[PDB]
RNA sequence: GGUCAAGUGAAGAAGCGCAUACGGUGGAUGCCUUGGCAGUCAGAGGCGAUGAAAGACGUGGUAGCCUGCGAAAAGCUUCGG
């Protein structure tokens, strides 16, 4: 998720964009306990999303 | 071919010694180096309340330790090769 992309948006709609990752971060620990998890590199690729949200978040001002 | 007497006296090693030939243990010697020591020529001579030097704990698809990072956590954004 480019962080060019991300600058097209508003605060109301990233916050919102970031909402949507917490879910997903969790609904994949949740997979990972169960053991019921194949696509693993899910993990690492959904931190690198939130981090690059708050970056852009952060550059608003 | 006998009987007797006198004399003489090889081998026979429980174990051991020396020599030699093969092993075992052990780690010397030789050769080697990703580690040190001592100079010369430069650098820049400080870091810290914008939180230092030194750490604890966490951070990975899976157990530990080291090396990096810090709940944005073996990394996030922009430039340049
Ligand atoms: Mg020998
Ligand atoms: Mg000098
Ligand atoms: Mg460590
Ligand atoms: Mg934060
Ligand atoms: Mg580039």
Redesign the pocket.
Known sequence: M???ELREKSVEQLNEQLLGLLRDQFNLRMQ?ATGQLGQ??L??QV??D???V???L??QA
């Open positions: 480019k962080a060019n990972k693993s590199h993990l690492s931190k690198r939130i981090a690059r708050k970056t852009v952060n550059q």
